[PDB]
Design an enzyme around this catalytic site. Sequence first.
Site, PDB file in Angstrom:
ATOM      1  N   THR A   1       2.531  -5.154   5.755  1.00  0.00           N
ATOM      2  CA  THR A   1       1.317  -4.326   5.318  1.00  0.00           C
ATOM      3  C   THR A   1       1.547  -3.515   4.478  1.00  0.00           C
ATOM      4  OG1 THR A   1       0.639  -5.014   7.522  1.00  0.00           O
ATOM      5  CG2 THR A   1      -0.664  -3.387   6.289  1.00  0.00           C
ATOM      6  N   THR A   2       0.470  -3.476   3.308  1.00  0.00           N
ATOM      7  CA  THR A   2       0.453  -2.819   2.242  1.00  0.00           C
ATOM      8  C   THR A   2      -1.216  -2.341   2.146  1.00  0.00           C
ATOM      9  OG1 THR A   2       2.419  -3.395   1.053  1.00  0.00           O
ATOM     10  CG2 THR A   2       0.799  -2.234  -0.175  1.00  0.00           C
ATOM     11  N   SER A 130       4.148  -1.139   5.477  1.00  0.00           N
ATOM     12  CA  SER A 130       5.331  -1.207   5.414  1.00  0.00           C
ATOM     13  C   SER A 130       5.819  -1.294   3.804  1.00  0.00           C
ATOM     14  CB  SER A 130       5.987  -2.398   6.072  1.00  0.00           C
ATOM     15  OG  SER A 130       5.569  -3.691   5.355  1.00  0.00           O
ATOM     16  N   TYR A 169       7.096  -8.004   4.794  1.00  0.00           N
ATOM     17  CA  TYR A 169       5.949  -8.123   5.431  1.00  0.00           C
ATOM     18  C   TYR A 169       4.688  -7.928   4.857  1.00  0.00           C
ATOM     19  CZ  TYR A 169      10.018  -7.693   8.616  1.00  0.00           C
ATOM     20  OH  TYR A 169      11.027  -7.867   9.222  1.00  0.00           O
TER      21      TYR A 169
END
Lengths: 201, 231, 212, 214, 242, 199, 234, 238, 231
Positions: A1-2, A130, A169
Amino acid sequence: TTTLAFKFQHGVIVAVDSRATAGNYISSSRVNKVIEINPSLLGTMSGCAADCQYWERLLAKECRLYYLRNGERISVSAASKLLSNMVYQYRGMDLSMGSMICGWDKKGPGLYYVDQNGTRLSGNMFSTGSGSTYAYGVMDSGYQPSLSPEEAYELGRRAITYATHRDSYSGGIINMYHMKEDGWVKVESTDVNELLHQYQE
Amino acid sequence: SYDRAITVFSPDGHLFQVEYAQEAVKKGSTAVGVRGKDIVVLGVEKKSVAKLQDERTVRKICALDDNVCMAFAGLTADARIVINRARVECQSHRLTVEDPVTVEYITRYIASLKQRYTQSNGRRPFGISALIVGFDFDGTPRLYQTDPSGTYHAWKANAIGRGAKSVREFLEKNYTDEAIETDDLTIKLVIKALLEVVQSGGKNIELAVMRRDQPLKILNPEEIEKYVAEI
Amino acid sequence: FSPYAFNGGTVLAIAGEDFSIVASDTRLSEGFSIHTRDSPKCYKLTDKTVIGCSGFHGDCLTLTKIIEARLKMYKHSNNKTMTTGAIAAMLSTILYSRRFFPYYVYNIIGGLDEEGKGAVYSFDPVGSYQRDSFKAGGSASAMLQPLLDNQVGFKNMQNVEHVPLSLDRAMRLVKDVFISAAERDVYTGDALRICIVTKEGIREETVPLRKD
Amino acid sequence: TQNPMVTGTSVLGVKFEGGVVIAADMLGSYGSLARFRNISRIMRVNDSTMLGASGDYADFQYLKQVLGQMVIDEELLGDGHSYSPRAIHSWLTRAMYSRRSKMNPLWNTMVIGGYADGESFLGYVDMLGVAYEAPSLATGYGAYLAQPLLREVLEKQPVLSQTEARELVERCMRVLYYRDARSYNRFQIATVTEKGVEIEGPLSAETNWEIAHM
Amino acid sequence: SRRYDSRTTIFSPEGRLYQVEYAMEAIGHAGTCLGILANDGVLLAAERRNIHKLLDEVFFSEKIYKLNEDMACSVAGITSDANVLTNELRLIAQRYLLQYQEPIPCEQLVTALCDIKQAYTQFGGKRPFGVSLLYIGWDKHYGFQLYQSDPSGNYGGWKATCIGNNSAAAVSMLKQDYKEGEMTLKSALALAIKVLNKTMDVSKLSAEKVEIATLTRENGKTVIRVLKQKEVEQLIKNHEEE
Amino acid sequence: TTIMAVEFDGGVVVGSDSRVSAGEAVVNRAFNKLSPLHQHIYCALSGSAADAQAMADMAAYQLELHGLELEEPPLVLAAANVVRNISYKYREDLSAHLMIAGWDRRDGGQVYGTMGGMLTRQPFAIGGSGSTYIYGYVDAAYKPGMSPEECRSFTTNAIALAMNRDGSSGGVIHLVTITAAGVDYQVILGNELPKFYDE
Amino acid sequence: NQYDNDVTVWSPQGRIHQIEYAMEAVKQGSATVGLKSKTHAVLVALKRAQSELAAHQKKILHVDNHIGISIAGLTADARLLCNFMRQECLDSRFVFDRPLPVSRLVSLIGSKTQIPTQRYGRRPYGVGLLIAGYDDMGPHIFQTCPSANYFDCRAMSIGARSQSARTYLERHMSGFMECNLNELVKHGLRALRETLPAEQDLTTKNVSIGIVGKDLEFTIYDDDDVSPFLEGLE
Amino acid sequence: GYDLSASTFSPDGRVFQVEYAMKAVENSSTAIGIRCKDGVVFGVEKLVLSKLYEEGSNKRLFNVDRHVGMAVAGLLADARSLADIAREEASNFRSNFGYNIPLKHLADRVAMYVHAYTLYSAVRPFGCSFMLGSYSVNDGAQLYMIDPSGVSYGYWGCAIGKARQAAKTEIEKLQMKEMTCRDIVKEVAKIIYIVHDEVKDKAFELELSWVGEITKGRHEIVPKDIREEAEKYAKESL
Amino acid sequence: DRGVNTFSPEGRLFQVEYAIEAIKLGSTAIGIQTSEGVCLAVEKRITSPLMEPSSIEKIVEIDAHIGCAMSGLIADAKTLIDKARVETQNHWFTYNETMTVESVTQAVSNLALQFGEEDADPGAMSRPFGVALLFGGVDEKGPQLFHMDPSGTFVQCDARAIGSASEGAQSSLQEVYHKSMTLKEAIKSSLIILKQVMEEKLNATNIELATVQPGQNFHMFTKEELEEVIK
C-alpha cells in the site's frame, strides 16, 4: 500500500494505489483506499484492510452524528482527534491502521496523519503504507507550494506510480482526489502500468 | 440503591416536582442578563448584604470557561453542583474537539442534565435557573437561559429569580438598538433593570461583564457606584 | 489445544448482466482424510442471494446459522427481505465482531442487486470486503483466479472482443476451472455444486469431480 | 477438557435398510494402559436415537448426564413432541462449538445414530464443532482403518440390510483390534430401528494369528 | 415499599426541602459556637453542653476538632453526625495532600464537604446530616479564614459568625462590635467573651462552660491550640472589669 | 501411594500404604490414607495431599448435611456422585483420586473409582503411583466370591507387593473392613507385612 | 381501595385487583377471532383507526414460519411479547434446527408473564393474545391472558364485544375440522362481523387475515389481498 | 391495614396476606389424592368454562419427574410456576446425587421455596395448593400436600379445592391401605362426581393420573379404557 | 399512593394517561403526507419579544430523509430525538442503507413504556415521555407520515394534528385533504390551518416548516420562503 497527501495553494491532493495482498498473493488490484466521509472530508487507508475499513466507517458514523447534533459539519482536526482516540482504546492489541484525514473546514485545508499507536499529526504533506518511502522521494523532489492544479496532479501521479514500480505490495490503479474549498472532486483512476510505460518512453 | 420515582405525572399532565423546583427559583435573588453589541453583562441582586460576610465567597456569577460564564437563581448549593458539572464538560470538550465550546453547546449540556433529573429514579429536580453568556469563536455574543424542567432558549435580555417578571416587563419596554449602542449604555440597562426590584439601589447589586475575547471581568463597588450616579 | 481445523474446499462466484453463479466442491477434509464427499459449501440466504463458505467447517456451520437468524430478525423489524448489498455490509460487521478470535471462513456472496444485475461480494476472514465481477475463494483460489482474470476479464490479451459474459459460457467456465482444480488441489474433488441466481429464482446443478 | 485423562478409541457407524448400527469397544484407556476394560461408550438417548463416544470418558459421562436429563425433561411434558436424531445432532454440535469457543472443549468425537419417520440418521460431531452426516462413520483410528472398508462396501452396494451391515461392522472391529494399539477385544453393538434402540454385548471378534508361523 | 418511604429528598409545594429546614431547627438548639477572624489569627469559642460533674475530661475538646496542620472546626447539632463529617474532612484533606503534596486550601476543603451534604439533599432517600460547621484555617492563597456550612450543603466565608443556640443575638452583637481590619486576636478574644456572656443564659459565664481554640502563624508554621482554663478564667475576669 | 478396595458379599475391604513423600524425602511414614466420609462410607486418598484432604473434607460436609436432610444413611452411590462432581468440576485444578468404598442397605458393599471426574463401579479397584506394579498380580489373583478374610489377605498382599517396588509407597498397611455391623480398622506394621521375592 | 394498586397485594376475597384491571385492557381492545380446521389455523382481526386520515393499526404479527399472533390491549406490551416470542423461536431453530412446538412456546409465555404478577412494583402485561401455529401435532389456536393463564382452544375471540363472536363460534364449531381453507376463513369472518355494530360492516380496510397450515407458511393478508375471502359473504 | 403485606403481623399474630392466598385456593375446583397399598391416584374436577376450549386444556395434573406427579388447585399461573420449580428441584437432585429424588425430600424443598414468599412485602404468597404423589420399590407409596403458607404434610387421602370438606368425608369411608391403584381409580372418580356441584359450577371434565406398581413407578395419566370404566362406574353409582 | 406501573380500573396505565394530558398543553404541529412529499408545520409559540425565535426548535432533522415535529414537554423529546438519530446511523453503519420511516418510528416507540421504579437498573426512566411526535420522511415506499404518542402506539397517517388545537386542526385537515393533494397545496393548507388555530397572529417568525420530498433532503423553510407562502 502506498498513499500520499499534500497541501498546495489550490487545496489538497490525495492519491492511493489499489493493491491488496495476502502473503505474496495479490488478492485484489482494484481495492478502494479512500473513504468519503462527507462532501469535504476524506480518509485514506493503509495497513490492515479490516481495521482500516471498520474504524474509518465508524468515524464516518460519528461525523454524521456530530453533524445532526451540533447542526454543523465536524472540523478536520476534530474528526482526526475522534479517530485518534477511538484507536487509542485498543492500543497494543495488534490493530494495523495508518490513515490520513483530509478536508477543508473553517481553518482552510487540513491534513492529519493518524495511526494505530495513537500518533496524530498535522502537516503539509504525508505518505503512508509500505511504499511510502518511495513516494516521499518523488513527492519531496517535485513539491512546491505554488504548484498549479495540473502540476499537482502530475506530482501525485508520479509519486504513486514510482512507489508501485519499486514496492512489491503496491500497484493496480492510482486513485486521486482534489480537496477544494467547496468540497473534494475525484480527479482520475489511471492504471499504473499505462502511466509507467509512458514515463519510460 | 434508592430507585423511587420522585418526578411523576399528575392528572392534568403536570410534573409537580418540576413545578416545585420552579417555585424555589422564584424565591431566589433577581439575576439579569443583557446581550449587547460587543459585550455581555450579568447582574445579580445581593439580597441581604451583611457587613461581616466575605463578599467573594458567595458570588452568584461564576465562570465556566474563558468565553463562558453564568449567573443563577434558586438553590445555591444546587447551583454549585451544576456549575462544576459544566466546568468539567468544558474541559472535556476542549480536549476532544480542540476548541472552546460554544455558549449554546454548554447551555444544551446543562439543560440536558436538568431534564435527566426530572425523569430519573431516586432524584429530585435541580432547584435553579441559569443565565449563560459568552462569545463563540466567530465573535457573536450569546445569552441563554435554562430552568429546572430542562428547557432552554436564546435571549436578548432576560431576568430570573424573585421579580423576574417585573424586570422582564421593564426590559421589554427598554431594550432597543439605542440602548445597547455602547458598552456603558448596555451596563446601565442592566443596572437600571436591576433597580426596579433590588431595594436600596447602589451596593446591593453584583455586576460582571464579558467583553469580546478577554476573560470575565467583575465591577467593583466604586465602579458600580459611578454608573449609578449617571442614572 | 487448537480451536481451528482446515477442512478444505473451494468457492467461486461470477456476476453476469442478469445472473449470478455461486459454485463449490463437496469434499470435506481433515488432515489427509475425507470426512465426507457430500458436503456442499453454498447456502441459500434469500431468493436472490447465495453465500459460499470455506475454511474451518465448525465456523462455517456457526456463521451460516447466525446469518440465517439475522435475516429473519431484519425481516421482522423492517418488513422486507435483506438485499444482497445489505447482507454484504452486515456480514462485514459480523466478521469484525470476532476480530480477536476470528472466524476462519472465506466468504463469497453471489446474488442480484436492486437493479436486477449480477452482484458478487468477496470477503476476508476479519470482514474486509468489496464488490467484484468474479472471485474465487478457499483451497484452490490461487489456481482459479488467474484463469478467471484471463478468460472473464480478458487480461493480457490483445485485439480481443470484450463480449458480455453469457450464462451459457459462464457455466462452461465454472465447470472447466473446477475440473482443473480437482487435478492439482488435493482438497478439491468429489463433486461440483453450481447455483445459478436469476430473476426466476435459484436453480442448482451437480457435476461429478475426481474422487481420488 | 485441556488434557483428556481416560479415553475411548474408535466408534463405528453404518446406515442400513430401516436402521443404523453402531459399534465401540468397552475400554477406558489411561495413556497406553488399558485401565478400565468393561465400560460402555454407547448410550441410548431416546427411542430413536443412540450415541457412541470416543475420547475423554469423564466428558462423555457429563454429556450423557446432560442429554439424559434433557430427554427426561421433554418426556415430562408429554405433548407429543420428542427430540429427533437430527435435533440431537444439532444440539450436540452447538454444545461442542460453544465449549470450543470458550477455549474449554469437551474432548470427545461422537457418532449419532437414529431412526425416525422411516429414515435413518447418522451424524458425526467432533470437539471443535465440526459436524456432518454420511452413510457410514468411524472416529479416531477407525477413519484410517475402518472407514476405508465401509466405503468400499458402500461403493458397490449403497443400500445393505441389517445382517450385511452387522457382518461388515464385525469385520471392521476385528481389523481395529489387530491394528489399533488402544483397542480392546470386547465391544458393544448398538442398533436402532423402528422397534427402538437395542444394545448388545459384550461381543468378541474371532481373531486369526496364522501369520505368526509365517 | 412506597408506603413506608418518608420521602426525604423531594420538594414541598413552595420549593422548600423540609428535612433540611428541620435539620436546621435541630442546630438552632445546639450549643452556641462563634468564630471571629483577626489580623493575627482566627478563633472559635463554643458553649460546652457536657457539664455534669461526673463527666471525665479525657479529650482535646468536646466540640473543636483539628482537620489537618492548618485548619480546625467546631460543630453544632447532631454530635454523632458531626463525628461522620469531621472524619470525612480529615480524609479529604489527606487526599489533597497525597495528590498535590500541599495542604488543602481552606475553601476547597469546605466546598468538598458541602458537596457531600448537598448530595444527601437531592438523591438516595436518607435524612440529611444535622450539622452546621465553623471552620478556621490559614492557607497561602487567602491567609486567615473563617467559613460556616449548614445541612443544605451551603457555605459562606465570614469575618465573624455564630451558629447554635441564640445565634441571631450573637450576630447582631458582632455586627455592632466587629471592626473590619482593626481586630487583633486579643480584641477578638475579648469580643468572643462579650458575645458568649450574652448568648448564654447562665449570667456568670464560667471557664468550665466554654472552649476556645485560637489559630495563629509562628515562624511559617500554623499553630492551633485550645486555651487552658486559667487563660479563659483571665479572659472572663477581663470582661467583668469592663 | 498405593490404594485398593475390594467388594465382597456383605461389604468392602479398603486398604492403603502410609507414605507421604516430598521428592526423595519421606515427610510422613505413618500416614493414614483412609478417611471416613460417613458412618459406613470410606475413601482412599491418592495424588496431592492438600487436594485429597480438601476434597474429602468437602464431601464429608456435603454428605453429612445430605444425610440429616433425608433422615437416612446416605447411599454409597450418592457419596461417589458427590466426589465425582467435585473431581470433575475442578479437574484442571485438583490432582487427586478419591477411591470410594462402603456399604448401604440398598446395594450392599460397593467400590467406586472417581479419578478425574469419571465414575465407575468395580469389583475391586487399585490406585496411586504404586498401583501400576500390581496390575498383573491383581488380575491373576482376584477370584469372585471372595470372603471378607480372603479380601483382606488379597488386599494386604497386593499393597505389600506394591510397597516393595514403588519408591513413593511404603511404611505400614492401613486396613478397613466395612459391613452392616460396622467399621473395623486394622494396621499391619512393617514386621508383620507379607513377604515375597525381594531379591 | 387499599387492595387495588399493587400486584403483590392479595385482597380479602382472594383476588388480585391489579391482574383484573390488566384484563380490562384486553376487553377494550379491538376484537379478533382464531379458529382451526384439521390442516389449517387462521386469525381474523378488526383493525381500528384513530381517525379517517389514519392507517388502521396493525393487529396481526409474524412470529415464525409456523407461528402467527393476533393482539388485543396495550400495543407496546404486544410488541414486547412478540419480540420475546420471536427470540424463542429463533433460539429453537439455532439450537435444535427445528421449529419450536407451539405448545412449548405458549408455556414460555405463561411463565414469563407470571413473574411480574408476584413482584412488588411490577405489573402484569396488559395484552391478550391469539396464537395460530402448525407443528407436528397439527394446527393450534392458543389464547394468552394478562394473568399468565393460557387455553388451548378450537376457536376463540377476545376484545370489545367478543362474546358475540364467541357465541357464533360455539354454534358453528362442529364443522370446523372438515372445513376447507376458503370455508374456514368465512366462519372466522362471520364470527368477527358479529361483534361489529349493526350499521358498520367488514371491508378491506378494517380486516386483517393470517393463515398457517400443513403446506403453507404463516402469511398475512391486508386490504386488497383480503378481497377474495371477502367476496362471497352474505 | 394489617393485611396489606406478608412482612406484617397483625395484633393477634396472624399473617392475613397468606390467608388471603388460601382463600384463592378455596374458591377453586377440587382435586383429590389417595394413597393405596401400591400407589397413588390423582383426580381433578376440571371445570370447563367454555365449549371452545380443546379437550385436555388447562391441565391441573403435571409430571414434575419420572416417578412424581403433581395435582394443583387455585391460580393456575401460580401453580404452573410451582410445577416448574418442582421439576427444577428433581432435576437438580439427580445431577447432584445420581438418583431419583425421594418424594419427602422433594416436598420439603418445594415447601421451603413456597414458604419464602410469605415473609416479605417485596413479593406475594403463592395462590395455589398442590399435591405430590410418587411410588418406588424402596420407598413404597408417598403422598404430600403443600399450601400457600408452606406447610408440608404426608397423607393417606387428601382433598383440595372448594369441596374439600365434603370430599374428605367421602375419602374417610374407604379402606385405601389395603386397596390398589386399579380399585382406587373407580373410587376416586366416584368421589369426584359426588362432590361436584350440578347447578353451580356446571360443565366439568375428569382428570385422572396415577403412579405405582401398575405403572411400574412412572407417573402417568390413567389409560382411557380404565378411565372409561371408572367414569362409567362413577355415574352409574351416584 | 400508587406506583408508576399501576393499572386503573378501566385497564389503562395512570401515568401514560397523564402523559397524554400533557401533550394537549403543547403547541400545535401539523403533518400532511402527499405524493410529492411530506410537510411539517409547528407553531413556535413565542412568549416574549426578547426571546430569540431561532432558539425554539420544534422541527428537527433525524436524518437526510426523515424530519420530526414534536409537541408537549419539549425537553423530554430531546432524548427520543437522539435515539432516533443514533438508530438511523447505526442502521447505516451495519446495513449500508437508510432506515425506513416506519422502522425509525418503531425503534423510538419501543422506549415509551420503558419506565419503572423497582426492577429497573441504574439509568432507567422513572416516568413516560410527555410528548407526541410526527415522523415525516421518504423511503422506498415514498413520502410517509407517522405519529407516536406517550403510550408507545405509532401509526401511519395521511394527515395529523398534535398539540393544544389537535381537535380543531384535525377537523380542518379531513375536510381539506384528498389523495391527489399536491405538496404546494399541503404546505398552504397546513399554514392556513395553523394560522386559524393560533392565538397569536401567524407570521414568518413564529412558525417552523420543513418538507421531505423524493430526491431532495430534509429542508427547513427559511424566512424568505415562509413569507412567499404566507401571501
